[PDB]
PDB file of C-alpha atoms (C1' of nucleotides) and ligand atoms in Angstrom:
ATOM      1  CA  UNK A  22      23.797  46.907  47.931  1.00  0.00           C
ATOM      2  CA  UNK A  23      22.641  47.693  44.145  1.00  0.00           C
ATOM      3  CA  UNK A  24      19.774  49.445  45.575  1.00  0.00           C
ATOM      4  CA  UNK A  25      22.289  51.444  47.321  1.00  0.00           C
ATOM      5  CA  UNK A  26      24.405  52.234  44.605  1.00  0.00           C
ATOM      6  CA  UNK A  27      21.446  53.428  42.814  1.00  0.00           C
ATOM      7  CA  UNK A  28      20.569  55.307  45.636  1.00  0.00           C
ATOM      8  CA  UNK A  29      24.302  57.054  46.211  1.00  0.00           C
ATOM      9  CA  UNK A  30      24.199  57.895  42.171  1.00  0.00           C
ATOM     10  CA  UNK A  31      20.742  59.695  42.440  1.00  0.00           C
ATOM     11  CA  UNK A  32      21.538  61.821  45.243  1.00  0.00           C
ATOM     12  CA  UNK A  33      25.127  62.271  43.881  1.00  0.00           C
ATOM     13  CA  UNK A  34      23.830  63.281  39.771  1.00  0.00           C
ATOM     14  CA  UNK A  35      20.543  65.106  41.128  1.00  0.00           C
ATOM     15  CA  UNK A  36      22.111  68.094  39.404  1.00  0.00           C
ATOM     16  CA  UNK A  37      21.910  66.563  35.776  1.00  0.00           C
ATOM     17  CA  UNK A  38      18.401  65.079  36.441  1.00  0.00           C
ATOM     18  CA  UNK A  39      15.303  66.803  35.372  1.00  0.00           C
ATOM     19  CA  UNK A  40      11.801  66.792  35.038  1.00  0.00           C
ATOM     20  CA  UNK A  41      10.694  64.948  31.959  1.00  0.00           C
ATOM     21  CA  UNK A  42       7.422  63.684  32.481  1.00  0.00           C
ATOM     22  CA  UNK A  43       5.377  66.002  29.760  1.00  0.00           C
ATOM     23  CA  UNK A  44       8.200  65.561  27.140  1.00  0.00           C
ATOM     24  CA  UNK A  45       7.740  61.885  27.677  1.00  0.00           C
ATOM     25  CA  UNK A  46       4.043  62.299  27.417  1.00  0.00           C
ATOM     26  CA  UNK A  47       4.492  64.256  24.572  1.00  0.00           C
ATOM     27  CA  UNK A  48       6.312  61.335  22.473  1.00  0.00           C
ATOM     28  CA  UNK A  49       4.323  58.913  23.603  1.00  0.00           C
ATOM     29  CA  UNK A  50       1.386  60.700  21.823  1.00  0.00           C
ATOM     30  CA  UNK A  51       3.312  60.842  18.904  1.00  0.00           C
ATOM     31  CA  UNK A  52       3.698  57.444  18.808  1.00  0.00           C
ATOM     32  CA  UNK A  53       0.544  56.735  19.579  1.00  0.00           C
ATOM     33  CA  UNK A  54      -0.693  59.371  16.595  1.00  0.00           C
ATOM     34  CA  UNK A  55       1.638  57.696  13.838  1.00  0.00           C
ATOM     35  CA  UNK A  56       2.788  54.549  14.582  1.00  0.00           C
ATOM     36  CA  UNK A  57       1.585  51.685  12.955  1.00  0.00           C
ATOM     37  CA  UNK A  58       0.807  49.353  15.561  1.00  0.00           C
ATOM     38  CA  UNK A  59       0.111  46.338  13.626  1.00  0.00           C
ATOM     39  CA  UNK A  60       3.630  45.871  12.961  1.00  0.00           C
ATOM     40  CA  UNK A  61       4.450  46.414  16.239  1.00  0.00           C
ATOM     41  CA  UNK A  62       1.929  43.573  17.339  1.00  0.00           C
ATOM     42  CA  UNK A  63       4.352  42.144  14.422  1.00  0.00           C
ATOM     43  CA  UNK A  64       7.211  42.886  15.716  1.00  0.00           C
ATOM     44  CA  UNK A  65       6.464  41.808  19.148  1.00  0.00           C
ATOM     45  CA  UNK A  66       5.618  38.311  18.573  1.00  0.00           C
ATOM     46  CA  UNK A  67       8.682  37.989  15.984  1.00  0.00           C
ATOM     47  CA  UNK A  68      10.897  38.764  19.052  1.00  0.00           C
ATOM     48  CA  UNK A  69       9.512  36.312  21.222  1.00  0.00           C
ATOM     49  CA  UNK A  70      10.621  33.112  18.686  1.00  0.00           C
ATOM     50  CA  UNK A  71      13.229  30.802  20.338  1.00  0.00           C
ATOM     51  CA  UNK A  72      15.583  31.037  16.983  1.00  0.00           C
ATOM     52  CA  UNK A  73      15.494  34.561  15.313  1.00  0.00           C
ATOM     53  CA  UNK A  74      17.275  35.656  11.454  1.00  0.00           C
ATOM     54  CA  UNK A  75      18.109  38.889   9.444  1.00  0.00           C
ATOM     55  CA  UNK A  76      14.480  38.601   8.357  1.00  0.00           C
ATOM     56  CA  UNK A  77      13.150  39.288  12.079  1.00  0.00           C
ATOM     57  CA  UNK A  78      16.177  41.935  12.645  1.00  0.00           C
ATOM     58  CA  UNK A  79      15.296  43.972   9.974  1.00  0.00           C
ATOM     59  CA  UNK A  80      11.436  44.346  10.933  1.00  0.00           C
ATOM     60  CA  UNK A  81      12.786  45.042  14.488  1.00  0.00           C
ATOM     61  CA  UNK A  82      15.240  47.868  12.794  1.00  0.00           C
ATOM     62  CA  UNK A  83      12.592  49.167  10.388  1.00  0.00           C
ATOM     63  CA  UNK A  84      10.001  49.709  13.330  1.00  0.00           C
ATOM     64  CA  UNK A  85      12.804  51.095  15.533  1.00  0.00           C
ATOM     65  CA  UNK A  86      13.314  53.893  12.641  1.00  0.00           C
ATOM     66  CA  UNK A  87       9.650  54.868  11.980  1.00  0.00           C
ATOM     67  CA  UNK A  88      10.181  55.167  16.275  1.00  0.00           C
ATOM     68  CA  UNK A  89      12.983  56.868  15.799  1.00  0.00           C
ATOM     69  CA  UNK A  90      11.690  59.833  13.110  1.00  0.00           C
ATOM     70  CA  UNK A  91       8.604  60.228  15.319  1.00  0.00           C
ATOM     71  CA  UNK A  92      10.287  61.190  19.279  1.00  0.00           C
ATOM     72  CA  UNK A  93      11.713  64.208  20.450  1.00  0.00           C
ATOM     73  CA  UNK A  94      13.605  62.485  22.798  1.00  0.00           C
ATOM     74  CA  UNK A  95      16.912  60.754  20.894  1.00  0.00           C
ATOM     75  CA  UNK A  96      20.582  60.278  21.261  1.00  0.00           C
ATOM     76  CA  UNK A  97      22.337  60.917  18.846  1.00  0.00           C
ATOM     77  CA  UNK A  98      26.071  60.106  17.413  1.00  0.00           C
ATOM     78  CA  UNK A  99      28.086  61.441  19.527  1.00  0.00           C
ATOM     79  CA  UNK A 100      31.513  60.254  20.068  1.00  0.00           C
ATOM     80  CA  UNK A 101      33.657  61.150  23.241  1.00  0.00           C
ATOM     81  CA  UNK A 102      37.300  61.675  23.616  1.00  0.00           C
ATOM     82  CA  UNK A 103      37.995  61.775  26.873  1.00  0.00           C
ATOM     83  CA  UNK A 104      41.408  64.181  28.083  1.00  0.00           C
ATOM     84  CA  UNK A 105      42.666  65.476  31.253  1.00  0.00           C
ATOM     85  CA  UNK A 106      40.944  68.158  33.036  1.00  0.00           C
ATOM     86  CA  UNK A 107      37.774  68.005  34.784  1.00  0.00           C
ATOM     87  CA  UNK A 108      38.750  64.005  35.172  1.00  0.00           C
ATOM     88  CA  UNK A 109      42.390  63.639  36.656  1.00  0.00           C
ATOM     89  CA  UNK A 110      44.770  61.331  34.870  1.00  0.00           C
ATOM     90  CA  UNK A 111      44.161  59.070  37.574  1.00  0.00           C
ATOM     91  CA  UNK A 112      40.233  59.028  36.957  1.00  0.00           C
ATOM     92  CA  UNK A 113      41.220  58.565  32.813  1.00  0.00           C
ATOM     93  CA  UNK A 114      42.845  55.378  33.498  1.00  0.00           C
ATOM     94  CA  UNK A 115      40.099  54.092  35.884  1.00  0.00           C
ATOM     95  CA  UNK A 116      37.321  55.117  33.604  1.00  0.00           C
ATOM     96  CA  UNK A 117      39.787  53.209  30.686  1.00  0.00           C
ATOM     97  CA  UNK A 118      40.079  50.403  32.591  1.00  0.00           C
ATOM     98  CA  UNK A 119      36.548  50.137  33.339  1.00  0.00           C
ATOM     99  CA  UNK A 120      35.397  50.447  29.543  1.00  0.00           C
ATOM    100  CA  UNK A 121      37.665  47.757  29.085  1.00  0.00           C
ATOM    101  CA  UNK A 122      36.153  45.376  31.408  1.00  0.00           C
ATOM    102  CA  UNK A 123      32.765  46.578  30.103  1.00  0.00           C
ATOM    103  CA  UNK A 124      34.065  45.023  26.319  1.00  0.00           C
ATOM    104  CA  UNK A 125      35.719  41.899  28.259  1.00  0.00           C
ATOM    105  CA  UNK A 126      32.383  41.053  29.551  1.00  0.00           C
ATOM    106  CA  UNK A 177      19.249  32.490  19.692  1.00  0.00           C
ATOM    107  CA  UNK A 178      20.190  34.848  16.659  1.00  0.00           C
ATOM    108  CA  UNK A 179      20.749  33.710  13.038  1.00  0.00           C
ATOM    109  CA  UNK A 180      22.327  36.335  11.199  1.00  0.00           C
ATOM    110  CA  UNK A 181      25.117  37.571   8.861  1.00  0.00           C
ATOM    111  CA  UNK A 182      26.268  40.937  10.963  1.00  0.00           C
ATOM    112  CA  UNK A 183      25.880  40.822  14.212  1.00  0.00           C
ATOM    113  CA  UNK A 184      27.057  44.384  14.702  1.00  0.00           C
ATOM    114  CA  UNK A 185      23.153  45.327  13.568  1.00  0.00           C
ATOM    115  CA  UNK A 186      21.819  44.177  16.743  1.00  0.00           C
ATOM    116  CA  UNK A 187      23.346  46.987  18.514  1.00  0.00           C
ATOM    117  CA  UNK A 188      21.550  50.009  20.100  1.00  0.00           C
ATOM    118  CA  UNK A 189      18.217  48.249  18.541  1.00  0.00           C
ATOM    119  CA  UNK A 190      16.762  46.233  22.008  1.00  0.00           C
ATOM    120  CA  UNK A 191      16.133  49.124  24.005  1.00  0.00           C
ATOM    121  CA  UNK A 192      13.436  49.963  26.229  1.00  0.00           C
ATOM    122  CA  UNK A 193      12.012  53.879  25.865  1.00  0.00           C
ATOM    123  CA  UNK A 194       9.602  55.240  28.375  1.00  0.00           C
ATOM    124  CA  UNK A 195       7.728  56.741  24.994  1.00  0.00           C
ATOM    125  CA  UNK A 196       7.231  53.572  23.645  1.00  0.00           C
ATOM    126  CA  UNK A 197       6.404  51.644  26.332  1.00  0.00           C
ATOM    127  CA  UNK A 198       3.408  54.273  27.495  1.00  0.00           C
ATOM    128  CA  UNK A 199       2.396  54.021  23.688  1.00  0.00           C
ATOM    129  CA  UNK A 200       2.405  50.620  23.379  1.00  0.00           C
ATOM    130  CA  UNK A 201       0.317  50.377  27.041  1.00  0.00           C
ATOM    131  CA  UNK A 202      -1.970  52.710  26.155  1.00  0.00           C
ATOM    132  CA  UNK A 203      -2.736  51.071  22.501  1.00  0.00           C
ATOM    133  CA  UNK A 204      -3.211  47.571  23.384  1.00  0.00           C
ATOM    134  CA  UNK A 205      -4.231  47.793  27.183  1.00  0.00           C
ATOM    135  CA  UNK A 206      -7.190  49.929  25.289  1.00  0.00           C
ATOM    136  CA  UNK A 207      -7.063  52.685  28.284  1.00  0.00           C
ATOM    137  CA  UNK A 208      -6.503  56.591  28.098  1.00  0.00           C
ATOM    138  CA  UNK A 209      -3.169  57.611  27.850  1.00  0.00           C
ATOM    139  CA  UNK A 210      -3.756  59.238  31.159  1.00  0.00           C
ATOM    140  CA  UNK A 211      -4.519  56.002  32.727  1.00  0.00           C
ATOM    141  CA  UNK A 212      -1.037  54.426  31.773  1.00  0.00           C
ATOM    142  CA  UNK A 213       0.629  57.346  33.567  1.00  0.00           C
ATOM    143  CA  UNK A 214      -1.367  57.369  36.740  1.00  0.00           C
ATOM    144  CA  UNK A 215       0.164  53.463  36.464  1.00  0.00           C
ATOM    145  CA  UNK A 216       3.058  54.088  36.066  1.00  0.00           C
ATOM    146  CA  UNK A 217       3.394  57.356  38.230  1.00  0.00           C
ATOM    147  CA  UNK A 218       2.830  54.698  41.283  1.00  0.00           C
ATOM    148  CA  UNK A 219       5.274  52.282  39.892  1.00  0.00           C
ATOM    149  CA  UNK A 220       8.005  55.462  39.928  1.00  0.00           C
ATOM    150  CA  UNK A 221       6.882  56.280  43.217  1.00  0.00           C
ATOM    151  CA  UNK A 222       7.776  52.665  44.891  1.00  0.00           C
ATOM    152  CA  UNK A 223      11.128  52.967  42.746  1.00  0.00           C
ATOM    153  CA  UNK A 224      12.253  55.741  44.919  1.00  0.00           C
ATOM    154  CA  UNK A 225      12.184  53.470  47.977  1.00  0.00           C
ATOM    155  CA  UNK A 226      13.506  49.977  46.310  1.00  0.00           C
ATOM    156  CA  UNK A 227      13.524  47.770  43.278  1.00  0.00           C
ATOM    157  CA  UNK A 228       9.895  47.738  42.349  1.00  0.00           C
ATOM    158  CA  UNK A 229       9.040  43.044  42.513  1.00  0.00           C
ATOM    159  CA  UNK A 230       6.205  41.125  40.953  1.00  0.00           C
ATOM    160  CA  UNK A 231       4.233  41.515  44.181  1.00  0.00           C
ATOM    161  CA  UNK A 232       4.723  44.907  44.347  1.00  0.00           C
ATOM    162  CA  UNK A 233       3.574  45.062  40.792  1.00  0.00           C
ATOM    163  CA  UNK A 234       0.715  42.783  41.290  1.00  0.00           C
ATOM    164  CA  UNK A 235      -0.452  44.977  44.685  1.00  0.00           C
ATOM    165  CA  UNK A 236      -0.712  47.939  42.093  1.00  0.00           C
ATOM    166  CA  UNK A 237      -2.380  46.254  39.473  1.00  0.00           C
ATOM    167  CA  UNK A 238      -5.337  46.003  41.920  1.00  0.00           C
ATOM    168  CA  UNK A 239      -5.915  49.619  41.867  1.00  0.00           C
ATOM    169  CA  UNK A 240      -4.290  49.746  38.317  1.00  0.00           C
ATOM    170  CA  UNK A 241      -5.564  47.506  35.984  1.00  0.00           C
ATOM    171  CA  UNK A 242      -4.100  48.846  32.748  1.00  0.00           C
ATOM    172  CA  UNK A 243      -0.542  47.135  34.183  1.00  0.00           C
ATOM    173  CA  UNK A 244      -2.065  43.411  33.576  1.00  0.00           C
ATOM    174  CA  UNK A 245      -0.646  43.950  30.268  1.00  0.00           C
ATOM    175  CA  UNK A 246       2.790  43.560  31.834  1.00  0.00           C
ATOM    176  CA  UNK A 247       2.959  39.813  32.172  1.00  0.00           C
ATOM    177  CA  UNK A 248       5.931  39.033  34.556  1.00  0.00           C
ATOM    178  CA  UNK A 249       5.321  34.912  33.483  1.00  0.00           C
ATOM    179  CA  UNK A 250       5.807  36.301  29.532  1.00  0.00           C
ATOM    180  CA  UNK A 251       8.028  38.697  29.957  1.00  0.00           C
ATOM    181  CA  UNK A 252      11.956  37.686  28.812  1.00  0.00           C
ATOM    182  CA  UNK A 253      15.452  39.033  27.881  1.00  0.00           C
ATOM    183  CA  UNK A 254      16.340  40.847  25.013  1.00  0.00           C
ATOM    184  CA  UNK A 255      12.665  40.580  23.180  1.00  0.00           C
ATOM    185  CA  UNK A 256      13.019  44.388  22.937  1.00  0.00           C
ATOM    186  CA  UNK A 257      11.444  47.344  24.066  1.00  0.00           C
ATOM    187  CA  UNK A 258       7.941  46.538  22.358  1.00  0.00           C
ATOM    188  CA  UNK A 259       7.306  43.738  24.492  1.00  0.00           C
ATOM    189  CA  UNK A 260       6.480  44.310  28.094  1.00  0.00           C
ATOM    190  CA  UNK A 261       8.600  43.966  31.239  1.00  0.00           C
ATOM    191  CA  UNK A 262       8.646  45.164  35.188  1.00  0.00           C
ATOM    192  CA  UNK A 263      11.862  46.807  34.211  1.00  0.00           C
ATOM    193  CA  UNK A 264      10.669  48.826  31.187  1.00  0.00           C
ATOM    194  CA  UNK A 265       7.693  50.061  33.038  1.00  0.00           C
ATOM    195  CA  UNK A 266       9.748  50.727  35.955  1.00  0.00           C
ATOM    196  CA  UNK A 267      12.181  52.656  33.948  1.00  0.00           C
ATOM    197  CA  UNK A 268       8.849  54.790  32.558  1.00  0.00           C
ATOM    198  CA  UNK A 269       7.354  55.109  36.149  1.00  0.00           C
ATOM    199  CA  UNK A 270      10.751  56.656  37.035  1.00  0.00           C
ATOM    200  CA  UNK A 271       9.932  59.848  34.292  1.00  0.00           C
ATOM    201  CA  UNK A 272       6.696  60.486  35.927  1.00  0.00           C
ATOM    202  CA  UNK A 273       8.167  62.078  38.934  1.00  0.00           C
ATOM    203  CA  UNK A 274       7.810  65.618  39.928  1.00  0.00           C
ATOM    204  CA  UNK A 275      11.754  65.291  41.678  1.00  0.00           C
ATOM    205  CA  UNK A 276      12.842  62.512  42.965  1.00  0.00           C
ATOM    206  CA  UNK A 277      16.433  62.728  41.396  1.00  0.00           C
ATOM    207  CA  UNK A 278      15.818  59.868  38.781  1.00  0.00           C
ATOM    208  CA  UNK A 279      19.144  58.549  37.091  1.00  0.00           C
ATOM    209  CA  UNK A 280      16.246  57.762  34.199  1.00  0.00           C
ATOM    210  CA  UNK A 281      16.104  61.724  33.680  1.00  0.00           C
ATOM    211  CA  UNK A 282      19.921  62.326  33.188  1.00  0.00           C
ATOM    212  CA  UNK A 283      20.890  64.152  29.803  1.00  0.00           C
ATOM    213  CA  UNK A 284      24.291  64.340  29.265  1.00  0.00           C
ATOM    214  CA  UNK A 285      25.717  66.792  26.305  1.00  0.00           C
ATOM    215  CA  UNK A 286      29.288  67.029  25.280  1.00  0.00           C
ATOM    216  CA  UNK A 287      29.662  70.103  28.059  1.00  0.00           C
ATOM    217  CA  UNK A 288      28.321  68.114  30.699  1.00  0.00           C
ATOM    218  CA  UNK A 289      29.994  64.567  30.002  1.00  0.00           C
ATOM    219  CA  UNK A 290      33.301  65.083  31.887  1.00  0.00           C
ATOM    220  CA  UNK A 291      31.403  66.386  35.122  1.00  0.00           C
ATOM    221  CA  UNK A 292      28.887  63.173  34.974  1.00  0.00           C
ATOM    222  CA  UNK A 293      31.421  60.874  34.496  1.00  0.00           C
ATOM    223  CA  UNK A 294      33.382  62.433  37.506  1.00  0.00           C
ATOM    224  CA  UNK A 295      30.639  62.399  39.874  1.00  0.00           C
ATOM    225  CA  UNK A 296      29.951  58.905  38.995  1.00  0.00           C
ATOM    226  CA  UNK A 297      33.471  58.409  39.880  1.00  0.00           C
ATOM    227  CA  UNK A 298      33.150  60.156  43.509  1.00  0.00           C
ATOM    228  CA  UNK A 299      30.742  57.246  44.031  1.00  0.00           C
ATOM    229  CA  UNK A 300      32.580  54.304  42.679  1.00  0.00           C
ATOM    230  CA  UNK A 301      35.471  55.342  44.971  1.00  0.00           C
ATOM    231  CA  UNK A 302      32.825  56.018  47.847  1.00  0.00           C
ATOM    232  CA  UNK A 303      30.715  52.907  47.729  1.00  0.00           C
ATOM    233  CA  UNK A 304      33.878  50.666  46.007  1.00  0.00           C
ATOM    234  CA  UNK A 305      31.122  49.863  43.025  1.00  0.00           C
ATOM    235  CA  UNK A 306      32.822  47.659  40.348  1.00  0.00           C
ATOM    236  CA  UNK A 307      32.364  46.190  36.779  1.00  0.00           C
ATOM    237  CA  UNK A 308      31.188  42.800  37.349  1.00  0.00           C
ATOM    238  CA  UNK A 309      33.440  40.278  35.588  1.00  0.00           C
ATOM    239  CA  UNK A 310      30.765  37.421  35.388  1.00  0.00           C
ATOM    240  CA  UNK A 311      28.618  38.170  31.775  1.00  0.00           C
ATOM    241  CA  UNK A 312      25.471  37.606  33.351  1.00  0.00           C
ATOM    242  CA  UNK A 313      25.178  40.475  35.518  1.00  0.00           C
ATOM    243  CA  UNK A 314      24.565  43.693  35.108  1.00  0.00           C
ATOM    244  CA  UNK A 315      24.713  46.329  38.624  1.00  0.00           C
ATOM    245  CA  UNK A 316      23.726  49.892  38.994  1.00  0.00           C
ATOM    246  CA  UNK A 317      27.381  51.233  37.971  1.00  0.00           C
ATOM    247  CA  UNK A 318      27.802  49.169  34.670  1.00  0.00           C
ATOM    248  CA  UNK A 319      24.366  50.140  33.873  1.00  0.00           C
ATOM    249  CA  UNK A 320      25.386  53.971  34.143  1.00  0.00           C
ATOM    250  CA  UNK A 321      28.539  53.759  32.745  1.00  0.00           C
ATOM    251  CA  UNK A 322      27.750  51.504  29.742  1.00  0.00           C
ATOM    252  CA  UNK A 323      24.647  54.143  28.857  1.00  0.00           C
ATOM    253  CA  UNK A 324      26.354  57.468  29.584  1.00  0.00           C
ATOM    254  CA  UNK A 325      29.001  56.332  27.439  1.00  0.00           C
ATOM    255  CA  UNK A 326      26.887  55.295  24.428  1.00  0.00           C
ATOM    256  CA  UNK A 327      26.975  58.920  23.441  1.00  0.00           C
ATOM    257  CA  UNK A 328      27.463  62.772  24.378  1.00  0.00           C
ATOM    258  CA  UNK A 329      24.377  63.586  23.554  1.00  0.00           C
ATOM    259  CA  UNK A 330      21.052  62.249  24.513  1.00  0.00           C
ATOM    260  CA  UNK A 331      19.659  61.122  27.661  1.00  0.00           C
ATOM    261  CA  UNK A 332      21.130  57.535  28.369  1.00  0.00           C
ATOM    262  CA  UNK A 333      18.536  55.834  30.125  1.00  0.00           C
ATOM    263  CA  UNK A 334      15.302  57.075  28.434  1.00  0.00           C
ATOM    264  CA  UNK A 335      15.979  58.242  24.849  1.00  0.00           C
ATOM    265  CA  UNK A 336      15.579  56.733  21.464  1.00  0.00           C
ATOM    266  CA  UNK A 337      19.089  55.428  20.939  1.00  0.00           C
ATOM    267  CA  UNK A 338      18.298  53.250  17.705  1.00  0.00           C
ATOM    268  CA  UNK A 339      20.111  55.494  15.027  1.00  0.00           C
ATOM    269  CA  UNK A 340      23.348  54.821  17.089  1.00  0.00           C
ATOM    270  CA  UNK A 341      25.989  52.841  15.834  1.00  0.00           C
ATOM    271  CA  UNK A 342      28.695  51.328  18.087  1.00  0.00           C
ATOM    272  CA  UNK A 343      28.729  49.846  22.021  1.00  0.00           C
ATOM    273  CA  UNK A 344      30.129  51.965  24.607  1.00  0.00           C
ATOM    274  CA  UNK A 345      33.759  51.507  24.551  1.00  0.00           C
ATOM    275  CA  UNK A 346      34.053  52.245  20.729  1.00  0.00           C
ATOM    276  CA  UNK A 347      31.728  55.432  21.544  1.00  0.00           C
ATOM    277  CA  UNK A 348      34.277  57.290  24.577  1.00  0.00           C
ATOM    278  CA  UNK A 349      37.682  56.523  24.322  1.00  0.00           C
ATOM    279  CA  UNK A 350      40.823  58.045  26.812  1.00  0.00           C
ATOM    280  CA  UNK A 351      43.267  59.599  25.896  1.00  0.00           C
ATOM    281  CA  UNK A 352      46.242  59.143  28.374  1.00  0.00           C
ATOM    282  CA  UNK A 353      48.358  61.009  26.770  1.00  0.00           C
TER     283      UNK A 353
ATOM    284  C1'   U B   1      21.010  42.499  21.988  1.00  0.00           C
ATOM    285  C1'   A B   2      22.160  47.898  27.468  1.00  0.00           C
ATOM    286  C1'   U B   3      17.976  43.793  27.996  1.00  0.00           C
ATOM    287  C1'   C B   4      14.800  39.686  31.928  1.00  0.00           C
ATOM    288  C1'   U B   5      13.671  38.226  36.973  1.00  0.00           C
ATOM    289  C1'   C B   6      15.729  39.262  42.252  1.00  0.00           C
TER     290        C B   6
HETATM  291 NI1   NI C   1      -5.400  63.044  19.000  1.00  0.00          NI
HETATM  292 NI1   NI C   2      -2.541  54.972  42.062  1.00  0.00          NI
END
RNA sequence: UAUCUC
């Protein structure tokens, strides 16, 4: 069913997807050009410790600016206030309700409000960081990954699938499924970060990845994504551990106005979701 | 931690 939803959301938001590949490219060069990539061999192994502190979090947040200053390709602070109009008062309270459910829903540190917005993965980064230490062509990692996006179009890219690949792609033995983890950031590798990088390499394709959303285009998005919660009856998952194709969506689009949810560097952000679009009911 | 694996 979540490839479905996926599925419903591309064909349904194809209008607000775009080609992005050669941007992408373009920022991962960057990266590659004037990022230091001994601290990110730093960084990555400081995120992998069992017990992190403030120590760790602040060479994770220092990296993520020098990231940050270097990509085209960045949300930025963009608050929403959501008001009758394009979305009915009907579709306010649902997408209220919603945001609500989204906030219902080993660090050693003083503010934990700093973690925010700084574990992200970034298509950029992660062809940067492939192309650096997997000691290929840039080109290489996007021929990769270009296959990877291509199997994403038909289902969730597995292990198997990934290992298949990796026999005609060698550069993606740097993505250790065994090694990979949660929240160790967007440094370190994972089948879903190169996935979500795969999915900008696509000439079509209607990739949720691509979306950009601006503050003309947010009320439109949001009701589309609507049409297909009330089509497929998606839902905000009330166990913590999950996270489907619709929370994904609506967690990222609301982040900010401006940007591109899925793919951008969202590090300068402050705030979660639910502090970043509010509805007003009036 | 908008992240892991399916
Ligand atoms: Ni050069
Ligand atoms: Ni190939």
């Amino acid at each position: 069913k979540s490839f479905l939803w996926t599925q419903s959301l591309r064909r349904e938001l194809s209008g607000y997807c775009s080609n992005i590949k050669l941007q992408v490219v373009k920022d991962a060069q960057a990266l590659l050009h004037g990022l230091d990539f001994s601290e990110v061999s730093n960084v990555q192994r400081l995120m992998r410790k069992e017990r992190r502190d403030d120590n760790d979090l602040k060479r994770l947040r220092d990296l993520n600016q020098a990231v940050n200053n270097l990509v085209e390709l960045k949300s930025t602070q963009q608050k929403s206030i959501l008001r009758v109009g394009t979305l009915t008062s009907d579709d306010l309270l649902i997408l209220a309700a919603d945001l609500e459910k989204l906030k219902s829903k080993v660090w050693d540190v003083k503010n934990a409000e700093l973690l925010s917005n700084q574990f992200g993965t970034m298509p950029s980064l992660t062809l940067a960081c492939l192309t650096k230490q997997g000691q290929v062509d840039l080109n290489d990692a996007v021929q990769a990954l270009t296959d990877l996006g291509l199997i994403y179009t038909a289902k969730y890219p597995n292990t198997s699938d990934l290992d298949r690949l990796t026999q005609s792609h060698p550069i993606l033995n740097m993505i250790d499924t065994k090694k990979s983890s949660l929240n160790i950031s967007g440094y370190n590798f994972s089948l879903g970060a190169a996935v979500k990088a795969g999915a900008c390499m696509l000439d079509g394709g209607n990739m949720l990845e691509t979306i950009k959303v601006s503050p003309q285009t947010m009320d439109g998005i949001l009701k589309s994504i609507l049409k297909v919660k009330k089509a497929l009856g998606m839902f905000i998952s009330d166990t913590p551990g999950e996270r489907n194709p619709y929370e994904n969506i609506l967690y990222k689009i609301c982040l900010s106005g401006d940007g591109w949810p899925y793919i951008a560097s969202r590090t300068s952000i402050t705030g979660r979701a639910w502090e970043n679009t509010v509805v007003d009911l009036e």
